[model samples]
Structures are given as structure tokens and as C-alpha cells.
Target: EGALIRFYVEIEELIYIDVFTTRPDTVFGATFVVLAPEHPLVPVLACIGERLGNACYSDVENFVEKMKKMSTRERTMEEDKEGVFLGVYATNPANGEKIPVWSANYVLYEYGTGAIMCVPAHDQRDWEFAKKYDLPIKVVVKPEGAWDFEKGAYEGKGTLVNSDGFDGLDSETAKRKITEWLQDRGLGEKK
Candidate 1:
């Protein structure tokens, strides 16, 4: 259900933030990218210096050190969803949109790619982060009735929206079609 999508850091040029997402149909709703605090790319990107937005090398090092002390189970818990912005941005392959990069404890290095594409409108955890940080919540899939954003994310299958040509396609069909579209563009691969 998940696939890896490559995101290029705006300033560093060579730095890539590869993220995993199960809901490919929600690609247009991706607002930000989150990496495991222990993700290997964190240090490498930190070393690039001030170009990483508000990120400070000392801060990144300290955050990683703090995360090192926690157990994987503790880190993955939704209650421990704290993170720091890397002050860097990555371009979304599907739309060429710039998304912020964050290093959060909730993501695990052992997971798929240690990076996640945040689609607040669909994923519960992503929705919480977006609400907490005031990030934009775009709805790509509209459920049968009016979706109450105040309640939480809608995880059920639905019709696609804001997804360009893929809009109006059902969840399953959209997933297959979007995956093919991304693969054709060399933006992602199915697993």
C-alpha cells in the first residue's frame, strides 16, 4: 500500500528526502515531510548550515541525542509526536510544490524510509501535527458526506479531489492510476 517518493531539498540541491506514503491518491494534500529524528539524512542536511531555514546545527545534534535515549516503542507513540523543523524545504515530485522538512520523534528509522509525507486531511497522526503546527489541511478525497475537519482525519475510501486529472477517481482506482502516473514520471516506484 505504501510507496517511496523522492523530494529534493531546495537549497542543498543534492540532498534528497525520500518519503513513504500508503495513500498515493492524497499526494496533492501533502503539506510537509517528516523524518525520523534519528534519520541519517538529518545530520547530513544539518551540516549544510544556515540554508536549513531556522535549523541550527547544535539544535539538530541535541535533538538527535535526546531521541537516542528513547525506546522505539516510546518514540512511535502518538503522545510523543514532538519534532523540530529542519528549516529546509523539499519539492514534491507530483506538483513541484515546496514542503517543509521536519524531524519528529513519532517517525521511526526502522520504518519504510524513515521519512513520511504528511497528508493532514487523511492521516490521523498527520492531522494532529498539522493542527498543532497550524499547517494547511487540504482535502484530496471527499467522503460520502460532509467531512468534519474538527473531528479528525477520514481514513475510509472516497472520491479524489484537488488531484488534477486523478480527481473524481475512487480511492482504489486512484491509487492504481496515480501510482502508474508517478512511476511513468520516474517520481516513485510501487513495492
Candidate 2:
């Protein structure tokens, strides 16, 4: 299961996005956020100019058009993921840190939510995207022994790290703890 959390784009238009993620415990590792190319907010994000930094309208337009032509299977396949940076960011609820937002072909509008919280170190797809975009990859979970991310994502059970008070806890324990933390802070809830 996943929970939808609101993300503000630090724009004058009060542009906000809701992203769904099953691994809320990995929120601290989120380096970026992603939206489906066909996501409704993509147009609004594209229109925002220098006020929100370097958002390029033409870049978003071309990417959207390119994605529109691909089949769902092709878009969601385990291939080289493509995306365009919106030049904007969303704040991470867990750490009050800013995370870049991107429109990527790998995201699907029909998914749980059009947007996703990207935890590169734990999620293979997100790891692939981060490596391709040269985005930061944060390790939030530590395995029994040394785990090499270059080999692939460590999506199995592990202890948490760099997760504030939740550090050192197992994956399942951290999930419940983080969910309660989010709820107590009114950032999200269990779904």
C-alpha cells in the first residue's frame, strides 16, 4: 500500500503535487520526485518561468509529445529511462529538504499516483533514473553486510540509516514508525 503526500513547488501559483510511495520509511533518501509526462501539473509547471528558477516550457512540451506517442508497455518497460527536469523542487516532509521534480517517461499516469517519491538507493527503477540523471543517491537502509548499490538496489529487508530517530530500525518497524510520524505531523496517513 501507498500513501499520497502533498508537495509544494515553491511557486507563486501555489502549485502543489501529490505523490504516492509505498516505502515511506525511505522518505529521507528521496533525492528527487517524478511525475508522469501526461500528469496534469506538468503543464502548470511548464508555464512557470524564472520565478521558479529554470523551468523550460519548450523542453516539457517536447518531452510530453514524445511520451504521448509511446505505448504503455514501452513507457513502463525496464529500459533506459528518459526525462526532463522541471527546474523546480518539492520539499521532503520528513526532513524539510528540497527535492528536484522531473517528468520522466518511466512514470505512468495509470499508476497508484502519477507522481512518485524517488528513493534511488532502495528502488531499482529510481536507482536507474538517478544514475542516468546524475542525481544524488542516498542510502537509507543498510544490509547485513556491505551492500554495493552499483550491483543493484537492495530492496530486501534491512536496517535504516540517516533516518533521524528511526535509524537502526528494521524496514517494517521503520515503516510503521515513519507512518505514525507523518500522521502526527499531519503530513500523511496509512492507506
Candidate 3:
């Protein structure tokens, strides 16, 4: 089992979120996060600026309104990657770097956690969405052979790169060690 990666939103308070992923090794490359459009957090995110002074409310409201008009039966992550920036950022536990949080219709409420860590270089949907939104894409997993990351994502087993202490580890090995590190720190656990 892999672990759930935790993220903390800095909005005058800590809003903890856990994203389920089988590849914890790639946590360093978690460029951003995505929550379902209907997630309860979206409305709360919209008003953060007013209570604390951040101006992303109207945009979030507009996006949420548009999303509501969409038919659930037509939601397709593969082709439709519509989303809006939540105008906020969350800290990635792996690297301690701040990454943007977005409300996207690509994810759904019934899904794993109604939220996901977007590792662009290694996930097809993440890759596409990042590209569409011009988000960062860092490669942590390098294939054993040649592959063009510029063209698309590499969702196969390989050696880890750019992943701090876990850099040179293989994908599977990094998964174990990274999860152990999270467990030791009370950040997450294998589930």
C-alpha cells in the first residue's frame, strides 16, 4: 500500500488535506493540488481574501457557478481539464515548498479523497492539466529507457530523480522509504 500525502493551506489557519497516491516517491514533484469543484473547501476558499485580504473570491465564485451548470455525466478528465485557481497555495509536506491549490471539475466527489496531488510529469491527467494551465512540471521518475517528457507523462516504474534524499532510489524502493519517512514524522502512513 502507498501513503496519503498531506497538504496544509495557510489561510490564517491550517486546513489539512490528504491526497491519496500510490507513488509517494514523486511527492517532491507535487506541483499543485486539485479538489473537486463541488468540494466543500471551494466556498470556504472563495472568502479567504475577504476575512484575511486575498482577492480570489469572485473568480472562484464564477468558476463554481460554471461548474455547477455542467452535467456530471459529461465530466471527462481525459479530455476536459477545466479548473480555476483557488487563489491560494498549500505547502507540500515533501519539499516544504508552497504549491497552488485549484478547484477542478476533473476530479469528482465520489473519487478517492475528492482531491489529488498533481504530479504533472508522471500522470496523464495531471500532465495535460498542468500544460493547459501552464503549471510547473518536474520529473521525479526517470524511465529505465528513453522517453520524451515534453510530449507526455511517464507513468511507469523507474528511478527517482530530483526527489531530495530519495533521488537515486527506484520507484518502488522510494515508495517504501518515503512512506516510512512520513510515518516517522506523523505526516502520513501506508494505507
Candidate 4:
């Protein structure tokens, strides 16, 4: 249920980050990389002259600052999510897609790796954030039948659908094979 997925921004080697995902199989449907607003790679990405989703790096800076001013406590947490695109793309290890790298308030270094491969169809957090930002959502896990993602993430178990070589495997087994496929390529590995 756990794996390390490497995501890299084109600007430089340090612009890279490893994302820890328990749903490694779900990543085959991933479309973007979400970084903690406080992620250490933020400065490096901006320094490398990456473009801006808001067309200005200052907007990214302000977003970070604004997030920092807030506090994190589980007792009364708010679902008030926000994100700023860094105008950079991280290469998704599985399909080699250019996944957008976005700085988001919801991610945190306190968690696994301060970054995540967003699978809108399977993760509640990813679905909410992706829907809020108009991000892409692709389906990989095909439920037993008739489950819909439009209402929310289809977290129930199912067979893999959109994943290329992993297409027809069970949602669980696909995790091992997907990790093996990427591990062999040195892009991901069991953690």
C-alpha cells in the first residue's frame, strides 16, 4: 500500500521531489503534482525561472505567505483549500506525462513527503482540490460496476482500467506490478 514516486521539475535536478503514496496503483490516473506551499523546492523552482500560472512569481510568493499565516490543528480544521501553479511540470514516472506542479496549502512536509501525485478519481483530497482548480481527472480503477466519480472519489476496490500495461489487473495487484515496472525503470520503489 506504500511506494515512493519520483517527480521532477525540468528547471534543475534539485527541483525534484519524491512523493509518498499509499495508493501507488491509483497514480496511473494521476495528472498533477501537488506540493506543500512550504515545500523546500519552492524557492529552487522559482529561482530557476519557471513560468507563472498567475504570470507573476510574486503571486506564488504571496500565496505561500498567506498560507503560513494560518495554523494547523485537527480540532477545528477547515477545508478551505487554495493553490498556485508554479508554471512548471513534473514528469509523471508511469506514463511520462508532463504533470503540473502546483503549490498547495493542503500539503505539508509533516506528512509523508510534502508532495503527492493527485488522482482525482480516487482521492477525496485530490478530487476536491482538482475540482476546485479545474484540474484533470482520469479514471484508472474501474469499480465492480456502476460506481460514479462525479459524486466523489470511487475509493472502493476495482480493476485497473486506464493504466496501460496494468490495464486489466486487480486494483491491489496493480500496486505491486506498477511499482515493479517503475522500480525497474528507477522511477519508483517500495518504501
Go through the candidates in order and give each one's C-alpha lDDT.
Answer: 0.83, 0.83, 0.84, 0.80
In candidate 2, what residue range of length 10 has the lowest lDDT sum?
A: 44-53
Q: Which residue pairs collide, candidate 1?
A: 52-87, 53-87
> What are the models' TM-scores?
0.93, 0.93, 0.91, 0.91
Model 3 lDDT, full chain set: 0.84
By lDDT, rank the candidates, best first: 3, 2, 1, 4
Candidate 2 structure quality by residue, lDDT tens digits, 44-156: 77677434568778878989998998988887785578999887888888888998888898889998778888988999998988888998889898888888987678888
What lDDT score goes with residue 104 in model 4?
A: 81
> Which residue pairs in candidate 3 have backbone atoms (N, alpha carbon, C) closer than 3 angstroms, thus clashing?
49-53, 49-54
Q: Residue 136 lDDT in model 4? A: 80
Can you write out model 4's per-residue Cα lDDT over 75-139, one digit (the tens) per residue?
Answer: 11584667887777888888778887787877876888888889999988888888889998799
**lDDT for residue 61 in candidate 2, whole number 0-100:** 90
Q: Which stretches of candidate 3 lie over 4 Å from their true place?
A: 49-55, 77-79
User: Residue by residue across 86-188, what tens digits does model 1's lDDT show?
Assistant: 7778888878899888888878888789888999899998888888888889888999888797779998899988888888899888887887888898888
lDDT of 3 by residue, 67-141 (tens): 878776676633377887776788888888999888887787777688899999999988988988999989999
TM-score of 2: 0.93
